[PDB]
Symmetry: C2
Subunit: 251 residues, 2 copies
């Protein structure tokens, strides 16, 4: 696989790295080229970048798997292929900086898996969510079975997969698909505002919320509690936190 | 669709309150196959009330050399998933048996035979017993519960080494690394296993319940949880009529002695 840079639009707007999925003729379907190029933009991110917005060019975030490029795979090949998708999504989930996905139109299959890997999702009214692979006998291979139940619970996912059930953006915000809904206006603009806001954070804030928080929450409570006192004491004792404490306190 | 039992592959007796189950394909060292496994599941289904222990043992010089290599059936990915699951359902009747299961080990205890042995609650090993997972040689992983049960006995590190290199362990080595709780250096694992079955036979049913089922769960729980669960198992056990009867008799015999 060679990364295909043509399938993305990458820009920097102040301290926000923006990454637009750019295959609007195929509704931003993910193929290997797209995913390898995306993996690249998320590697060795320049230090002036303090947030990432992933968005879609055109009406749609992503319709998921490229059905043209539909390949033929044995059990072994499919394990390797899914694992490669996982390694790309790892660059999102474990990004050094918060990744915010601006969702609109189709957020479907691997598109939804991709939105799941981001930290914050902002949904415009037109967005919708589906896991339509089930109808073709295909389970998810892009992290969805681990990431989406953490947002929406097993039972709603299981129903989606069994019946092809679709959710709107408006239903979706209540059920856990996104933290934000923009009923009138643009997901991209709001993600950019959010990007600019999270860009003000101390780096250790990011670490603690992006890395430590999901692990603390998932631990035995006694374990998570001690891990919390440790993360907190380290955060609090950092120079940046003292500088922020003093500035505010000084007036 | 289910596989039909071949009961001729097993020799089943009842000695007092011990159901004895002898693996009986000696010409192939008690190589496991679908009908033996189905017959096995049958013996452990609806085990009559008079039975208070199960000894599984091998006819011949060997316990089991594992999967019958003359009886390989070609299987796609889905089929091999279904087939693995099938074997798991047989071993669940050992692990979750209502009475304790003791495996008498001698000669070959390898591959599926080790996995069978792992499902048992207690293993007694004669000097000749030897342990291996030769499957890795053949490009293949275990499908009989071994990656779950065995590391709990001997740890991942020793398992991983056995699989990557074909390392074999004797009965003497094995009692030390965790393969068996007992070693019989002279005489017979069967004889020992049968005296153990007579001994567990004396236990109250709720003791078998707490030990066989609750204990593993409590021990792998997070500590605060296993602990509350222990208090709960403990109080139920202790407040049961069989327990009180035994405590009555224990304190009536010391007041008989005085």
């Amino acid at each position: 696989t060679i990364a295909d840079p043509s399938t993305l639009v990458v820009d920097t707007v102040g301290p926000v790295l923006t990454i637009g999925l750019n295959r609007p003729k195929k509704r931003n379907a993910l193929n290997d080229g797209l995913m390898a190029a995306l993996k690249d933009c998320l590697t060795d991110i320049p230090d002036q970048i303090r947030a990432v917005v992933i968005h879609g060019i055109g009406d749609h975030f992503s319709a998921g798997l490229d059905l043209s490029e539909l390949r033929e795979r044995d059990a072994t090949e499919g394990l390797v292929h899914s694992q490669t998708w996982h390694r790309v999504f790892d660059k999102i989930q474990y990004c050094r900086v918060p990744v915010i996905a601006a969702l609109k139109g189709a957020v479907i299959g691997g598109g939804l898996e991709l939105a799941c890997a981001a930290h914050i999702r902002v949904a415009e009214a037109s967005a919708y969510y589906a896991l339509p692979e089930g109808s073709r006998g295909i389970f998810v291979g892009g992290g969805g079975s681990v990431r989406l139940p953490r947002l929406i619970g097993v039972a709603r996912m299981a129903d989606m997969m069994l019946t092809g059930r679709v959710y709107s953006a408006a239903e979706g915000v209540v059920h856990g698909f996104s933290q934000y809904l923009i009923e009138n206006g643009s997901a991209y603009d709001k993600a950019l505002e959010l990007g600019n806001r999270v860009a003000q954070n101390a780096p250790l804030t990011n670490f603690a919320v992006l890395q430590a928080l999901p692990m603390i929450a998932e631990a035995n409570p006694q374990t998570g509690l001690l891990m919390e006192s440790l993360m907190a004491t380290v955060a609090q004792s950092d120079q940046e936190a003292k500088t922020r404490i003093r500035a505010f306190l000084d007036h």
